[PDB]
């Protein structure tokens with residue numbers, strides 16, 4: 386018979402098992418979250434999207450999960466990123482008092498995973514899930530990341546650092562989660578400065594990417610929020626990582 390097919394990849398195999406296992410692992414090494422009930426976390430995560438049409442998801446659907454995974458890390462230890470996360474995560478493994486969203490319980494639970502359900506039944510769809518462009522933007526995955534990315538970013542203070550992909554057409558992309566959500570929730574009451582770290586790929590010919598038109602575009606957004614702006618090139622990721630704990634030696 387007929388089964389509905391979306392354009393995007395389906396739910397990651399073993400998603401329920403993985404999400405539960407991730408919660409158990411996280412709470413074991415983070416004594417601050419040690420007594421979070423991981424079954425309740427999974428129940429809330431699941432309840433946000435199962436039995437719902439996967440284009441009828443709103444931010445409120447994830448509010449029960451958000452409450453259970455409440456975690457407000459030191460606001461002055463936030464690292465944001467856009468497009469690429471590999472270096473960001475490597476950085477927080479070296480500078481271990483720093484956090485990306487994916488180093489918090491909620492980000493950790495969902496990073497690299499895809500998920501969606503269907504109307505009326507409790508079945509997880511492992512065949513397909515809506516594509517943000519071809520099907521609908523209001524899908525379980527896109528809506529999840531939108532709501533957690535805002536919460537994480539809006540709480541930030543002092544200097545907020547963001548890693549940007551300097552190999553792309555738009556080094557700063559206003560249509561990314563950082564550009565459309567996070568940058569607009571930085572509060573000048575708490576945030577003194579946004580500092581951009583532009584990551585060079587292999588084809589950037591050692592040029593000063595802080596002079597890029599999209600960086601001026603980011604600078605303008607930030608200045609209009611009465612926040613200071615700073616930009617630095619990361620020419621060599623491996624050299625950058627080696628110098629993290631001694632940047633002025």
Ligand SMILES: NC(=O)c1ccc[n+]([C@@H]2O[C@H](COP(=O)(O)O)[C@@H](O)[C@H]2O)c1
Pocket residue numbers: 464465466467468469485486487492496497530531534560561562563564567
């Ligand atoms: N871990 C993810 O897959 C994921 C997805 C969407 C947004 N985010 C958060 O938003 C930012 C990146 O999103 P963009 O690449 O769309 O700017 C990062 O700060 C990240 O913490 C993460």
